Amino acid sequence: MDYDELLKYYELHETIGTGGFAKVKLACHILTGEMVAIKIMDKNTLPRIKTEIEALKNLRHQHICQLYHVLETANKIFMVLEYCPGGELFDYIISQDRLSEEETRVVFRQIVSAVAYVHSQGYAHRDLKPENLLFDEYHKLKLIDFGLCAKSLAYAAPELIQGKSYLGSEADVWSMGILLYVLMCGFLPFDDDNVMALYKKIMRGKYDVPKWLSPSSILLLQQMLQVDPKKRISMKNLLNHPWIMQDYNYPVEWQSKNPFIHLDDDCVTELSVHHRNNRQTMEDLISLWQYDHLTATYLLLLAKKARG
């Protein structure tokens, strides 16, 4: 009976192809009709799951794939998440071969927005890579997989691989430098079929600079891809970096537009018809954010309203 509780709230669709600790099944939320993605972990096949749940309960942002609902049985943990049908950024880059500087900037400012917010909340992602960024129905990016977060070798900073002490924020800035390179080049700056030769290339920090990269793109890459973590650009300076500001003229908006405090009156009203609470009781219950079916219903109604 591992799916009994889940089936009270969701109608299951197909399992999508994945690789790792979890299966991902598509589904729709019965009450709202909204599509969701459900990450399913078999308990006896645990810390990584608990770290991701704790982080996502505390993080809420326009560029972070939203946690709606956590369910647990003796054999499984279910995480109901924001539906991102546009696929991985990794597959998008390959489909385009490489992105122009302009399209890279569109995508990269969204990554900076999410990561700056994560650091502002006291976390470091630690596994930034294009497989961990999914496009939603509005072609906007959503950061996933917070299982390795703190309070993949090709993207790992030299100090992280070496098992040396490090600051999660500096490791994230390095990984963002690798991401920036892959967006504009369509291939990794450090790559090798042999793990030891890749390890050597990362520690050396030397990479090819293709002819299509602009001088400003090259300079930003130099500021992020510094082997010495103390020489890496800070997240604060990345927000208004000249390359980042080119064609925008305003720093990256990293602050969350998705609140914990403010509730949407229309969604509280819609939700209330399914319950037997007075309005104050209903708002107080939603404000507890237990990530139960109530949390899921409220956030999915907010997603439904946002579509217009």
Ligand SMILES: CN1CCN(c2ccc(-n3cc(-c4ccncc4OCC4CCNCC4)cn3)cc2)CC1
């Ligand atoms: C017909 N057409 C097919 C594609 N389809 C769709 C695919 C995926 C998703 N989706 C997945 C997540 C998700 C969230 C958090 N952590 C991991 C996740 O997925 C990991 C997979 C691993 C393999 N590569 C894709 C991403 C959120 N939405 C939503 C919709 C829409 C309908």
